[PDB]
Amino acid sequence: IQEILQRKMVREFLAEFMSTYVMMVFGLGSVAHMVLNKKYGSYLGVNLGFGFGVTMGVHVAGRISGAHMNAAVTFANCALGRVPWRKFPVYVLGQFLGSFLAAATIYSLFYTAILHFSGGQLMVTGPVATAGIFATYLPDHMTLWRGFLNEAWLTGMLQLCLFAITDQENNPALPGTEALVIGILVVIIGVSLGMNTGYAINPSRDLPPRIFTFIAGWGKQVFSNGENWWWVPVVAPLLGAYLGGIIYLVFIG
Amino acid sequence: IQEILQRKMVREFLAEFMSTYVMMVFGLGSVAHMVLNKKYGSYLGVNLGFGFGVTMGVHVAGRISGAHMNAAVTFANCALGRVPWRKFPVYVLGQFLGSFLAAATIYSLFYTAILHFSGGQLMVTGPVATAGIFATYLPDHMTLWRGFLNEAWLTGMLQLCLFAITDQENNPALPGTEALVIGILVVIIGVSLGMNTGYAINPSRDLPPRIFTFIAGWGKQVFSNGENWWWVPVVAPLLGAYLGGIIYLVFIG
Amino acid sequence: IQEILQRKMVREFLAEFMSTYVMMVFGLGSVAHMVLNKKYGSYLGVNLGFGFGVTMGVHVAGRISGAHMNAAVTFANCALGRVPWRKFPVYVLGQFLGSFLAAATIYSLFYTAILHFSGGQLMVTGPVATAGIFATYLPDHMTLWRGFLNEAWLTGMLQLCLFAITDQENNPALPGTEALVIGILVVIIGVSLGMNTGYAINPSRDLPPRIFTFIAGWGKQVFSNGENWWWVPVVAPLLGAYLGGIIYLVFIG
Amino acid sequence: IQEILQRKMVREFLAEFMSTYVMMVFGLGSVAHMVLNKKYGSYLGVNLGFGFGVTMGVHVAGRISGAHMNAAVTFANCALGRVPWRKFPVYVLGQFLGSFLAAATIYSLFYTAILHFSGGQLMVTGPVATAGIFATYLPDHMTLWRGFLNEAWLTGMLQLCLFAITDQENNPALPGTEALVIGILVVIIGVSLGMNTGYAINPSRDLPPRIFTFIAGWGKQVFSNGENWWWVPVVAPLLGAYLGGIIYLVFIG
Amino acid sequence: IQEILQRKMVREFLAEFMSTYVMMVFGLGSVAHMVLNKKYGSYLGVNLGFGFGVTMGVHVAGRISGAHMNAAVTFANCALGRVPWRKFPVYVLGQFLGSFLAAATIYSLFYTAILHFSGGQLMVTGPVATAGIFATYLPDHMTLWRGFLNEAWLTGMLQLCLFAITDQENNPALPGTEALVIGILVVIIGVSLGMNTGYAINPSRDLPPRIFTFIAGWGKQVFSNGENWWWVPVVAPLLGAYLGGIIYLVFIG
Amino acid sequence: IQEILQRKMVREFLAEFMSTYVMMVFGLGSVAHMVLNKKYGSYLGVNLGFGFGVTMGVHVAGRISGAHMNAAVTFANCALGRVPWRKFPVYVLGQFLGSFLAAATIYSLFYTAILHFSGGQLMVTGPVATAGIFATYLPDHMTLWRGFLNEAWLTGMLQLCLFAITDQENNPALPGTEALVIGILVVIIGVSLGMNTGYAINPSRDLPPRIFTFIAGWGKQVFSNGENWWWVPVVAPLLGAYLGGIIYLVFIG
Amino acid sequence: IQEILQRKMVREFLAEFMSTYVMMVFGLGSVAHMVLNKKYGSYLGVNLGFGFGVTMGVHVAGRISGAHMNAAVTFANCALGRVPWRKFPVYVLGQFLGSFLAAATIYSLFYTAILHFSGGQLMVTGPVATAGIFATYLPDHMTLWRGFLNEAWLTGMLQLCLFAITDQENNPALPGTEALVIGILVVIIGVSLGMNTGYAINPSRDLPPRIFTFIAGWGKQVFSNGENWWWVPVVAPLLGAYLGGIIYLVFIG
Amino acid sequence: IQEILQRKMVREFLAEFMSTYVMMVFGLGSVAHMVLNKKYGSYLGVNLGFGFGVTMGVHVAGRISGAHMNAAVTFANCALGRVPWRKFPVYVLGQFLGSFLAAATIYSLFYTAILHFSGGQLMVTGPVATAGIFATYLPDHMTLWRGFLNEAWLTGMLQLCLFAITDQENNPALPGTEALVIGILVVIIGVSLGMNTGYAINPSRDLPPRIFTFIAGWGKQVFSNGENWWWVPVVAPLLGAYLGGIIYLVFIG
C-alpha cells in the first residue's frame, strides 16, 4: 500500500481526483443554494463558488499534475505537445471519478431540502425541476447549434486566458498568486457569458453528474431532454479549447 | 506585570484571545445586520464578514501562535503530531474567552435595534426570534443526524484546504499573502454549503455565544431547542477536522 | 507569414487587438446579462465584468505594448512624452478593430435572447430598447454638457490612479500583481460614478460598437439620439486623461 | 513655484490632500448611487466604494506621508510617539481641504439627479432627504451616547487592525500588497458594523462635507439635527483610535 | 318523453339539478382562476363567484322547488317540518348529479392550464397541488376537530340568516329581490370566515367533486389526506344547519 | 318558559342580542382575516364584512326593535324623542352581551391561526400584535383629541345618513330594500374615513371585545395603551350621533 | 327628418346602436385601464366595467327593442320564435356600427397613453402589444378547438341565465330591477370563466373592433394571429346561445 | 328663524348644500386614503367612495330639489327647459359652499397623516405632492386639449345615462331604487374612464377645493400648474352635459 502510493502515475491520478472533487463540491453546492432557497441563493454566489473552488483545487494539485480539472484543457495541452498523450486516460479517469463522487456528496447533504422543495417528485422539467442542480439543460429560446457555438467560444476564451496567465515568458502572474487570478477568470466567465447554456465549458463538470442523476432516480429524460443535448457539452469544449490555445500560441506567443 | 506578559505561554494565550475576538466581532456583526435590517443585510454580507474577519485575525496572530481561532483545528493539529498536547487547554481557553466577550460586545452595540425589532421580547423561536444572531439553530426540514453529517463534512473540507494552502513542500500561497486565501476559503464555505446548519464548523464560534444568550435573558430554550441540538456543533467538527487532515496527509502529502 | 508576424509593429498591433477584444467581450457580456435577464443580471455584475476583463487584457498584452486598451490613455501617454507619436495610429487601429469584432461576437452569441426580449424589434428608445447593450446613451434628466463634464472628470480620475499604480519610483503595486489592482480601480469607477453617463471612459469602448449597431439594423437613431450625443464620449476622455496625467506628474511625481 | 513644491512639508501636504480627495470622491459617489437610484445602488456598493477608494489613496500617498487620510489615525500616531507633533496641523489641514473639495465635486456631478429625486427641495429629514449623501445622521431608534459608543469602538477596531497589517516585526502583509488588505479591512468594517451610525470613523470624512452642505443650501438643520449630533463623529474616533493602538502595542507588540 | 317531464317530482329533480350545476360551475371557475393564475385571480373573486352563482341558481329554481342547492339546508328543512321527508332523496340526488357534472365541465374547460401549471403531474399536496380546485383540504396549522367546529358554526350562521331573509312574517326581503340578498350573504360568509376550512358548508359542494378527482387521476390520497378529513364536510353541516334553524325558530320566530 | 319569551321586552332584548351577535361575528372575522393572512385578507374585505353584517342584522331584527345594534344610535333616538327612555338599558345590555359572545366565538374559531402568527405570545403592541383584531388602537402619528374629533364626526355622518335613508316623508329607500342601502352606507364609511381611528363609531363594537381581551390573556395594556384611549370610543360617538341627528331634523326634516 | 325618426324600424335601429355604444365604451375603457396602467387597472375592474355597462345599456334600450346588444342573443331569440326574422339585419347592423364607433372613441381618448406605453409601435404580439385592448387573442397554452369549446359553453350559460332572469312565468327579477341582475350575471361570467379566451361571448364585441384595429394601423396580423382565430368568436357563440336557450325551454320552461 | 327656513328657496339651497357636502366628504376621503396610505388605499376604493357618496346625497335631497350636486347637470337641465333659469344661482351657490366646507373638513380630519407623509412640505408637484387630494391635475403624457376632449366626453356620457335612468316614459329604475343605479353609474365612470384626467366631470367637485388649497398654504401653483389647467374642468363639462342631454332627447326620447 505504501509502495503503490509512491508511484508517480498513482500520485497524479490522486491529485486530479482530489482537485476535481473539491472544485465540483463547491460549485454544485452554490447551484443547489441558488435553486432551492431564494433568500440564501443568487447567481453571483454560483459564479463565486465555481471560481474559488477552482482556486482551492489549484492549490491542492498545482505542482503534482498541473491541476487541469478539465478534460478539454487536458486534451488541448496533449494535442499541442505540452503533455504526453499517455497521461490523458489517467487524468480523465481521475476527473470523472471525482466529479461523480462530488455529485453523490451533494445529493447526500441536500436531501431533505430537495424533497421539501419538489414535493417528493424528482422532475427534469417544470416549475419544481431539480435535475439542473447537477447538470446543464438548454433554455427555452435557444436551439442546439446556438448552444454548440456558445460552448465552443466560451471554452476557447478560457483556454486563451489560461495560457496568458501562466506564461513565464510573456507576462505571468507572480508565482504563488496565480490560483487567485485563475479563480477570478472563471468567476467572470460565469458573470459575463453564463446564461445562454449554463457555461459547462467542461466535460467532467457535465457528464458524470448527469450519469449520477440517471442512476439516482430522475429517469432517462436527463439524456433525451432538449433534443439530445447531452453530447454537446462533451464535444464542443474540446474544439473550443484547441482553437483558443492555437490562436494564443500563434499570435501572442 | 511587565515580566508576566513576557512569558511565551501568556503571549500565545493573548494572541489566541485577540484573534478570536476580532474574527467573532466581524462575523456576529454581519449576522446581526442580516437578521435585523432587510435593506442593509444579505447572506453574501455574512459570508464576507466571517471570511475576512478570519483574514484579519490571521494577520493579528499568525506568527505568535499560528492563529487557529478554532478548537477543531487545534484538536486536529495536536492529534496529528504538529502541536504538543500541553498547549491545547491554553489555546481553547483563549478562544472561548474571546468568543464570549465578542458576543457581549455585539449585544451592547446592537441593543436598541434588537429591542425595536423584537418588540421587547427575547424569543428563541418565531417570526421575531433573535437568538440566532449569536448561535446556530436547526432549520425546519432537517433532522439531527443530517446536521451531524453536514457539520462533519464541512469541517473536513475546511481542514483539508487549510493543509493545502499552508504546505511549504507542495504548493503554498506566497508568504505574506496566505491570510487572503484563507479568508476566501471561509467565504466560499459559507457561500456553497452554509444553509443546512448555519456552518458553525467551530466549537468556539458556537458554544460561548449560546452560554451568553442563556445568561443574558433568552432562557433555557437555547439548549433544548431542536431536540438538544447544542452538542452537535461541539462534537462533529472534531471528527471532521481529524478525518480531513489525515486524508490530505495520506493521499496528497 | 512567419517573417511578417516577427516584426515589432505587427506584434504590438496584434497585442492591442487581442487585449481589447478580450476586455470588450467580457464587458458587453455583462451589460447584455443585465439588460436582457432580471434574474441573472445586476449592476455589480457589470462593474465586475468590465474591471476583470481589463485584468485579463493586461495579462495578455502587458509586456508587449503596455496594454492601453483605451484611446484616451494612449493619447495621454503620447502627449506627455512617454510613448512616441508614430505608434498612436497602430494602437488606435488595433483597439478599434478589436472592439468592433467583440461587438459582432456578442451579437452572435445573444441573438435569440435579444429577439425574444424585444419582440423582434430593434429599438433605440422605449421599454424594450436594446441598442444600449453596445453603446452608451444619455439618461432622462441629464443634459449634454453635464455629460461632457462627467466623462472628462471620470477619465481624469482613471488616468491619475493608473499613473499612481504603475509608478516604480513612488509606491507601485508589486510586479506581477498590478493587473488585479487596475481591475479593481475600473470596478470601483463603475460602482461609484457610473450611472450619470454609463461611464464610457474609453472612446474604443464606445464608437466601434455604435457603428456596428448602425450597420446591423438599429438604424441612424444611434447617432442622433440625445441631441447628437455620440461625439462626447470621443472627445471628453482625451481632455480628461491629459489633465489627470499632468496633475499627477506635477503634484505627486 | 518650482522651488516651493520641492520642500518636504509642501510635498506631504499635497500627498494628504490628493489621497483624501480620491478616497472621498469614491466613497461619496457610492453613497449617492445608493440614495438616489434603487436599481444601480446597494449597501455592498457603498462598502466597496469606500474601501477600495482607501486602497487607491494608499497607492497615491503611501510612501510620501504614510497616507493617513484620517484625523483620528494621525492623532493616534502622533500621541503614541510614531509621528512628530509638528506635522499634525499640516496633515489635518490637507485632509480637510481634500474632503471639502470632494464634496463640492460630488455636488457638481450629481446635480440633476439630486434635483429630480428631491423635487427641487433640499431637505435634511423626510422621505426625500438628501443631506445624508454628504454627512452622517443618527437613525430613528438610536440615542446619542449609544452612537458615541459605536463610533469609539469602530475606530478602535480600525486602528488595531491597521497596526497589525503594517507591522514589519510581527506578521505584515507582503510589501507592495498592503493597500488591498487595508481596503478589505475598511470594506468589512462597513459590512459588519456600519448601520447603527453610518460608520464615519473619520472626522475628515464627516465635518467638511457637513460644512459644505450648510453653505450650499441645506440650512442650519445639518448641525442641530439629532440633538446636536455633529460633534460626536469628531470626538469619539480620537479616543477610540488611541485606545485601540495602545491595546495592540501592549498585548501583541 | 313529454308526459314524463310533466310530472311534479321529475320537474323538481330537474330544477335542483340545473340550479346546483349553475352554482357549482361559477364557484369552481372562480377557484380555478385563483389557483392557476396570479394576475387574474383573487380571494374576493372566489367569494363573488360562489355568492352570485347562488343568486343565479335561485333565479333558476326558486319557485319550482325552493332552490336549496345544499343537502344540509334540505335536511334542516325536512327535519323542522317545512318539507316532507319523501322529497329528501330526490333533491339530494339531483344536487349530487349537478355537482359531479359541474366538476367534469370545469375539468374540461381548464385542462391545458392545469397541465401547464402542474407540469403534467396531478398532485394532492405540494407547491403545485391542483386537487384543491375541486374539493377542500385542511390547512397546515389546523386540526380535525377545530375544522369540525368551524364547519358546524358556519353552516349554522348560514341557516339562521336564510330563515331571516325569507320570513314573510318578520322582515323579509322584498319579493323579487331576495336572490341578491342570499348571494350577498354567501359572499360575506366567504369573506369573513372562509380561510380556516375553505367554507364548504355544503355536502353537495364537497363530496361529488372529490369523487370526480379520485376517478379522473388524482388517486386515493384525496380521501386519506388530512387524517381522513373527507367525512367532516359531510357530517358537520347537517348538525350546524339544524341547530341554527332551531335557534332562529325559538328565539326570533 | 313559553310565556317569559312571550313578553314584549324579552322579545326586544333577544332581537338586539341576535342582531348584534351576527353583525359583530361578520365584522371581527373580516378583521382577523386581514391581520393574520396576507393572501386572504384586505381592507376592502373588512369594509364589506362590517357593512353587510349590518345588512344581515337589520334583516334579523328590523321590525321587532328597529335593529339599532349601536349604543350611540339608541342614545340619539331616545334623546330626540323617537324612543322612550325606559328601553335604553335593555337595548344596551343586549348589544353588549351579543358583542362579548361574538368576540368569544371569533377567539374560538381562529385560535390556531392566532397562535401560529404570534409565536404563542399575546401582544398588544409590536410587529406581531393581535389585540387589534378585537378592539381599536390609536395609530402612530395621531393624538388623542384628533381621534376624538374623528370619532365624533364619523358618528355624526352615520346618524344623518341613517335618518335620510329611513324617512318615509322625504325620500326613503323602497320598503324591503333599505337593509342593503344601510349596509352600503357602512361600507363606504369604512372605505372613505376609516384609517385614522379604525372607525369604531359604536361603543358596543369597541368596549365588550376589549373586556374580553383583558380577561382572555392580553393583560391590562389593552386599557392603558395610547395614553388611556379606551374611553374615547365610548364617549365621542354619543355626541356625534346626537349632533348629526339634530342637524338633519332642523335643516332637512 | 322628424317623420323619418318616428318610424318603428328606425327607432329600434337607433336603440340598438346607442345601447351597444354605451356598453362597448365602458368595457373597452376598462380593458385599456388594465393594459396600460398597473396602478389604476385590475381584472376585477374589467369585469365590473363590462357588466355594469350592460346594465346602463339595458336602461337605455330595454323597452324599445329588448336591448340585446349581442348578435348571438338576437340569433337565439329569432331562431326560437320569440323575435321575427326580418328584424335580425337591423339589430345586427346597429350593434356593429355602435361597436365600431365605440372602438374609435376609445382610440381617440387613450391615444397618448397608448403611444407612451408602446414606444410608438403598434404591435399585435410581444411585451408591449396593444391590439388586445380592442379584440381578443388566444393565450399561450390554449389551442383553437379548446377555445371554440370555451366560447360555446360560456355563451350557452349566458343565454340560459338570461332566460331565467326575464321569465315572467317562472321566477323573474322584480320589474324595474332586472338590469342590475343582468349586469351581475355578466360580471360573474367574467370573474369565473374569462381567462381562457377573454370571454368575448359576443360577435359584436369582437369583430368590429378588430376591423378598426386593422384599419387604424395594427396591420393584417390581427386576422392571422393565433392560426386564424378571428372566426371562432363569430361562430361559436351562435351555437352556444341556441343550445342554452333550447335547454332552458325544454327542462325548466 | 323658523319662518325663514320654511321658504321654498331656502329649503332648496339647504338641500343642495347638504347633499353636495356629503358626496364630497366621501369622495375626498377616498382620494386621501389612496394617496397617503398604500395598505389601506386603492383606486377601486376611490371609485366606490365617489359613487356611493352620490347615492347618499341623492337620498338626502332627491325630492326637495332633484339632488343635482353638479353645476354641469344644473346647466344642462336649465338650458333644456326642465328647470327654470332663476334657480341656477341658488343651486350653484349651495353646491360651491358645500364643496368648500367638505374640503375644509377633509383637511382637518387628515392633518397629521398629511404632515407625516409630506415631511411638513405642502407641495403641488413631486414624489410627495399632496395638492391632488383636493383637486385634479394633468398627468405626464397628456396635453391640454386632450384633457378638454376627455372631460367633455365623460360629462356627456354621464348626462345621457342620467336621463335614461330617471325617465318615467321609457324604462326607468323602480322608484325608491334609482339612487343605487346612479351610484353604480358614477362608480363605473370612475372605473372605465378616470385615469386620463382624474374624471372631475363636475365644476363643483373641482374649483372650490382648489380655492381652499390656495388659501390653506399650497400657494399659487395650484392655478398655474399644467399650463393653466384650472379652467378646463369648469368649461368642458357644461358643453359635454348639454350635448349628451340633447342627443338622448332627440334619438331616444
Q: What residues contact G150, with CB distance under 8 A and at least 6 apart?
A: E109, G193, G196, G197
What's the CA gap between G225 and G209, in Å, rounded?
15
Collapse the DSSP code of A73 into the 3-class scheme (helix H, G, I; strand E, B; otherwise coil) and give the result: helix
| Beta strand residue intervals within H105-249, DSSP E | none
Chain C interface, Cβ < 8 Å to G:
117-121, 123, 125-129
Cβ neighbourhood burial of E121 (10 Å; 0-12, 13-18, 19+) = middle
- For the four alpha carbons of D75, D79, D81 and D86, in that order, the dihedral sign comes to positive
Cα of B120 to nearest chain F Cα, Å: 8
What's the CA gap between G127 and C179, in Å, rounded?
42
Q: How far is CA H113 from CA F199, H25, H31, in A?
A: 16, 17, 13
SS (H, E, C) A97-112: HHHHHHHHHHHHHCHH
Q: Report CB contact under 8 Å: B37, D188.
A: no
Q: Which helix (H) or strand (E) holds H41?
A: none
Q: Tell me the three cell numbers of residue H252.
A: 331616444
- Looking at residue F167, the DSSP 8-state letter turns out to be -
Q: Contacts of residue F53 in chain E, CB cutoff 8 Å?
A: 188, 192
Q: Tell me the three cell numbers of residue C221.
A: 437613431
Collapse the DSSP code of E166 into the 3-class scheme (helix H, G, I; strand E, B; otherwise coil) and give the result: coil
Q: Contacts of residue H25 in chain F, CB cutoff 8 Å?
A: 157, 192-193
Q: How was this structure determined?
A: cryo-EM
Chains interfacing with D (3 or more CB pairs < 8 Å):
B, C, H
Question: Which among H119, H125, H129 has the least Cβ separation from residue D123?
Answer: H119
D125: number of Cβ within 10 Å: 14
Query: Quick one: which of D30, D52, D28, D53 has its CA closest to D41?
Result: D30
Q: Which residue type sits at E35?
A: V
- For the four alpha carbons of D1, D7, D8 and D13, in that order, the dihedral sign comes to negative
On whether the CB atoms of residues G108 and H148 are closer than 8 A, the answer is no
Cα of F133 to nearest chain B Cα, Å: 18
On whether the CB atoms of residues C105 and C20 are closer than 8 A, the answer is no
On whether the CB atoms of residues B103 and B25 are closer than 8 A, the answer is no
On whether the CB atoms of residues B233 and B207 are closer than 8 A, the answer is yes
Q: Tell me the three cell numbers of residue H112.
A: 397629521
- Rg of chain E's alpha carbons, rounded to an integer? 18
Cα of F27 to nearest chain E Cα, Å: 7
Q: Which domain holds residue A37?
A: 1-253
On whether the CB atoms of residues B21 and B30 are closer than 8 A, the answer is no
Q: How far is CA G212 from CA A110, G127, G135, G217, H219, in A?
A: 58, 22, 10, 9, 46
Q: What residues contact B130, with CB distance under 8 A and at least 6 apart?
A: B35, B114, B117, B118, B122, B123, B218
Q: Tell me the three cell numbers of residue E141.
A: 396549522
Query: How far, in whole angstroms, is CA E194 from its chain's centroid?
Result: 13
What's the CA gap between G206 and G216, in Å, rounded?
16
Query: How far, in whole angstroms, is CA E16 from its chain's centroid?
Result: 13
Q: Domain count of chain H?
A: 1
Torsions phi, psi of A4, nearest 5?
-65, -45
Query: Quick one: which of B151, B101, B122 has its CA closest to B221?
Result: B122
Q: Contacts of residue C129 in chain G, CB cutoff 8 Å?
A: 119
Angle of CA points H42, H44, H45, to nearest 5°: 65
Q: What residues contact E108, with CB distance under 8 A and at least 6 apart?
A: G149
Q: Which residue type sits at C45?
A: G
What b/e string do you get for E83-94 counting C-beta neighbours within 10 Å, with b at 16 or more? beeebbebbbeb
What's the CA gap between D74 and D89, in Å, rounded?
10
Cα of D85 to nearest chain B Cα, Å: 28
Q: Contacts of residue B121 in chain F, CB cutoff 8 Å?
A: 121, 123, 126
- The distance in angstroms from the start CA to the end CA of chain G is 44
What's the CA gap between D71 and D91, in Å, rounded?
8
Q: Contacts of residue A181 in chain C, CB cutoff 8 Å?
A: 55, 59, 179-180
Cβ neighbourhood burial of D151 (10 Å; 0-12, 13-18, 19+) = buried
Q: Tell me which of C128, C130, C218 to substitute to probe the interface with G (most G C-beta atoms closer than 10 Å).
A: C128
Question: Which among H14, H37, H42 has the least Cβ separation from residue F195?
Answer: H37
On whether the CB atoms of residues H31 and H70 are closer than 8 A, the answer is no
Q: How far is CA B68 from CA B16, B56, B75, D182, in A?
A: 7, 12, 10, 22
Q: What residues contact D5, with CB distance under 8 A and at least 6 apart?
A: C250, C251, D11, D14
Q: Which residue type sits at A181?
A: V
Query: Quick one: which of C159, C135, C145 has its CA closest to C216?
Result: C135
- Looking at residue H1, the DSSP 8-state letter turns out to be -
Question: Which among A18, A110, A177 has the least Cβ separation from residue B251?
Answer: A18
Cα of F166 to nearest chain H Cα, Å: 9
Question: In which residue are the cell numbers 493543509 written?
Answer: B163
DSSP codes of every residue in A203-243:
HHHHHHHHHHHIIIII-THHHHHHHHGGGHHHHHHHHHHHH
Q: Report CB contact under 8 Å: E59, G181.
A: yes
Cβ neighbourhood burial of C140 (10 Å; 0-12, 13-18, 19+) = exposed
The half-sphere exposure of H78 on its side-chain side, counting CA atoms within 13 A, is 17
Q: Calculate helix-pair angle for A178-193, C43-61, nearest 10 degrees.
A: 130
What's the CA gap between D149 and D160, in Å, rounded?
17
Query: Quick one: which of H150, H11, H158 has its CA closest to H71?
Result: H158
Q: What share of chain G is helix, strand, coil (3-state, %, to 5)?
A: 70, 0, 30
DSSP codes of every residue in B164-230:
HHT-TTT-PPPTT-HHHHHHHHHHHHHHHH-SSS-----HHHHHHHHHHHIIIII-THHHHHHHHGG
Query: Quick one: which of B48, B76, B22 has its CA closest to B205?
Result: B22
Q: How far is CA G148 from CA E28, E106, G229, in A?
A: 20, 15, 9
On whether the CB atoms of residues D8 and C151 are closer than 8 A, the answer is no
Chains B and F touch (3+ CB pairs under 8 A): yes
Angle of CA points F200, F204, F208, to nearest 5°: 105
Chain G interface, Cβ < 8 Å to E:
43-44, 141-143, 146, 149-150, 153, 157, 160-161, 164-165, 170-175, 177, 180-181, 184-185, 187-188, 191-196, 250-252
Q: How far is CA H141 from CA D230, G131, H52, H146, H226, in A?
A: 44, 20, 31, 10, 11
Q: Tell me the three cell numbers of residue E221.
A: 390520497
Q: Calculate helix-pair angle for F8-36, F43-61, nearest 10 degrees.
A: 170
Collapse the DSSP code of A196 into the 3-class scheme (helix H, G, I; strand E, B; otherwise coil) and give the result: coil
On whether the CB atoms of residues G51 and G183 are closer than 8 A, the answer is yes
Q: How far is CA A54 from CA A51, A68, A70, A157, F200, in A?
A: 5, 10, 10, 16, 65
Q: Contacts of residue C126 in chain G, CB cutoff 8 Å?
A: 118-121, 128
Cα of B177 to nearest chain A Cα, Å: 8
